[PDB]
């Protein structure tokens, strides 16, 4: 136990920012897949 000190968070801003970018990219790719599946369904629904 040390007096005169406090602990900050144990987070690193660099890793968090890169994870923001990567998670956004994953979201975008999954949305593209969902859009493809909707387009296929609409295509069958127009015969």
Q: Which residues bind a second copy (CB under 8 A)?
A: 13-14, 17-18, 21, 40-41, 44-45, 47
- Smallest distance, a second copy to C-beta of residue 47, A: 6
CA distances from residue 34 to 24, 25, 30 in whole angstroms, order as listed: 15, 14, 6
CA distance 28 to 9: 30
- Smallest distance, a second copy to C-beta of residue 12, A: 10
CA distance 37 to 45: 12
* C-beta of 6 vs 21, nearer to a second copy: 21
- Smallest distance, a second copy to C-beta of residue 37, A: 10
């Amino acid at each position: 136990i040390n007096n005169g000190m406090l602990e900050q968070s144990n987070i690193d801003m660099t890793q968090e920012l890169v994870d923001l970018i990567s998670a956004q990219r994953n979201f975008q790719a999954n949305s593209r897949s969902l859009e493809v599946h909707n387009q296929l369904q609409q295509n069958i629904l127009q015969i």
